[PDB]
């Protein structure tokens, strides 16, 4: 409920827009450096004359983000700057998203990294539903952020209350709710674990939808050395009948989640080695 201030790492700094140097573009997102400390941050510029639809989704994503300060698996907001013509939203800068990480990798992402990712994203979605009654509705690799510090976080929620390729069967053919995001996460995990989107050779959005309904769930291959727990977690996420798909409280008890809650995985070192191979 305050503006003109940046809170980074518990410390509050009085700030204006002029205290920030524009380091280039990444709705408009800028990479920017806070001159008072050297902190490099991401800054969204919501123009007052901008699109009402985009500005609505920006204000909606910010509203959820401001509520999520006590969740370590959601990208955080440092503060805002309100001028006569713009609103600048200061977000913590992450390294990349899982989609760009897949293309730069040009291959499968290891299971040990996807386990830490599954833990963070499931706890992020569980926090959203339980603490704020929020359903994400658009879980996909481009909304999973990772940084050099090893952190994995879910990012801005324009549609928090959808991409066709990750729609659950019950969103395509509604019987007439969080479990639909469980399906999207299962599809993202298969895509990131194989390096290939599961429903291949689709030229239209509708063709993707027919494959989600007409074909069996695209589970993990049994010849990549995937652990039995990982294959079990994916198969549960990809249960086509949503009435039997597990909710978040049951997924959080899964042995796949329990292993990577306590297992030391150096996501930071693996992340910097991948990005070094540009
Ligand atoms: C490729 C890439 C790089 C950075 C980010 C990112 N870092 N912090 C963010 C806050 C809000 C939205 C996006 C952010 C994303 C991304 O895809």
Numbering used by the authors: 117 to 142, 148 to 282, 295 to 309, 316 to 417
Which sentences from the paper describe this structure?
Covalent binding to lysine involves challenges such as the increased pK a of the side chain and its considerable flexibility. Here, we describe two computational methods to derivatize lysine-binding covalent small-molecules based on known noncovalent binders, approaching the design problem from two opposite directions. We prospectively validated these protocols by designing and testing a new lysine-targeting MKK7 inhibitor.
Our results suggested that installing an aldehyde at the para position of the phenyl ring and replacing the acrylamide warhead with a hydroxyl group will allow the ligand to bind Lys221 of MKK7 covalently (ligand RMSD = 1.3 Å and ring RMSD = 0.7 Å, respectively). To validate this prediction, we synthesized 1, incubated it with MKK7 (Overnight, 4 °C) and measured its binding via intact protein LC/MS. As the aldehyde warhead is expected to form a reversible covalent imine bond with the lysine amine, the mixture was reduced with NaBH4 (5 mM; 1 h; Room temp.) to trap the covalent complex prior to LC/MS measurements. Significant labeling was detected only after the reduction of the complex, which correlates with the reversible nature of the imine bond. Compounds 1 and 4 showed IC50 values of 738 nM and 695 nM, respectively, compared to 1.1 μM for Staurosporine. Compound 1 was confirmed to covalently bind to Lys221 using X-ray crystallography. The crystal structure confirmed Lys221 as the binding site, despite poor electron density at the covalent linkage, it showed a large movement of the lysine side-chain, which is pointing away from the ligand in the original cysteine-bound structure, indicating the formation of the covalent bond. Elevated b-factors and the electron density map indicate flexibility and/or lower occupancy of the ligand, additionally this partial occupancy might be the result of the reversible nature of the imine covalent bond, and reflect partial hydrolysis of the bond. Comparison of this structure with the predictions from both of our protocols showed close agreement to the obtained structure, with some minor differences, such as our ligand-side protocol placing the hydroxyl group at the opposite side of the ring, resulting in a slightly higher RMSD value of 1.8 Å (0.5 Å without the hydroxyl), and our protein-side protocol showing a slight rotation of the phenyl ring. However, no experimental density was observed for the hydroxyl, hence our prediction might still be accurate.
